Amino acid sequence: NYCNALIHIKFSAGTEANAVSFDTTFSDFKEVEDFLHFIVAEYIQQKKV
Amino acid sequence: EGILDEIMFNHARIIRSELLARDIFQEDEENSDVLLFQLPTTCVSMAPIQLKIDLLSGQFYFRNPTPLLSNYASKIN
């Protein structure tokens, strides 16, 4: 609508080329940061396992 | 024009004072024409949202309304 910001996030885990692990939409930057932090923590845990 | 503006501001102030008396919106110290509504954005966050009154037609509006926020502002109107 020329003023609102919509962020579409597609995170594909390293399992398959088409098995999209997560695909979400966001309109609040705060939730964007929260989900980014969660994804970073999940990646760190995956690297720790 | 000045009389009309004074009547407009007085009506808006009366409505705002009624809302404050109902204790639904907290008082904004910085702006006397802005109402603060407490809403939790996340589980732990507890943040205020600024609602303002149109000086011309008198419909409540948010500063950066989300689609749900815009829908419920229209419902308020």
Curated annotation (Swiss-Prot), chain A:
Coiled coil: none annotated. It comes from the Eukaryota. It is found in: Nucleus. Component of the Mediator complex, a coactivator involved in the regulated transcription of nearly all RNA polymerase II-dependent genes. Mediator functions as a bridge to convey information from gene-specific regulatory proteins to the basal RNA polymerase II transcription machinery. The Mediator complex, having a compact conformation in its free form, is recruited to promoters by direct interactions with regulatory proteins and serves for the assembly of a functional preinitiation complex with RNA polymerase II and the general transcription factors. Present with 1720 molecules/cell in log phase SD medium. Belongs to the Mediator complex subunit 17 family. Component of the Mediator complex, which is composed of at least 21 subunits that form three structurally distinct submodules. The Mediator head module contains MED6, MED8, MED11, SRB4/MED17, SRB5/MED18, ROX3/MED19, SRB2/MED20 and SRB6/MED22, the middle module contains MED1, MED4, NUT1/MED5, MED7, CSE2/MED9, NUT2/MED10, SRB7/MED21 and SOH1/MED31, and the tail module contains MED2, PGD1/MED3, RGR1/MED14, GAL11/MED15 and SIN4/MED16. The head and the middle modules interact directly with RNA polymerase II, whereas the elongated tail module interacts with gene-specific regulatory proteins. This is Mediator of RNA polymerase II transcription subunit 17. The lineage of its organism: Eukaryota, Fungi, Dikarya, Ascomycota, Saccharomycotina. The chain holds residues 639 to 687 of 687 of the full protein.
Swiss-Prot record, chain B:
Component of the Mediator complex, a coactivator involved in the regulated transcription of nearly all RNA polymerase II-dependent genes. Mediator functions as a bridge to convey information from gene-specific regulatory proteins to the basal RNA polymerase II transcription machinery. The Mediator complex, having a compact conformation in its free form, is recruited to promoters by direct interactions with regulatory proteins and serves for the assembly of a functional preinitiation complex with RNA polymerase II and the general transcription factors. Component of the Mediator complex, which is composed of at least 21 subunits that form three structurally distinct submodules. The Mediator head module contains MED6, MED8, MED11, SRB4/MED17, SRB5/MED18, ROX3/MED19, SRB2/MED20 and SRB6/MED22, the middle module contains MED1, MED4, NUT1/MED5, MED7, CSE2/MED9, NUT2/MED10, SRB7/MED21 and SOH1/MED31, and the tail module contains MED2, PGD1/MED3, RGR1/MED14, GAL11/MED15 and SIN4/MED16. The head and the middle modules interact directly with RNA polymerase II, whereas the elongated tail module interacts with gene-specific regulatory proteins. This is Mediator of RNA polymerase II transcription subunit 14. The gene is RGR1. It is found in: Nucleus. Present with 319 molecules/cell in log phase SD medium. The lineage of its organism: Eukaryota, Fungi, Dikarya, Ascomycota, Saccharomycotina. Coiled coil: none annotated. Belongs to the Mediator complex subunit 14 family. It comes from Saccharomyces cerevisiae (strain ATCC 204508 / S288c).
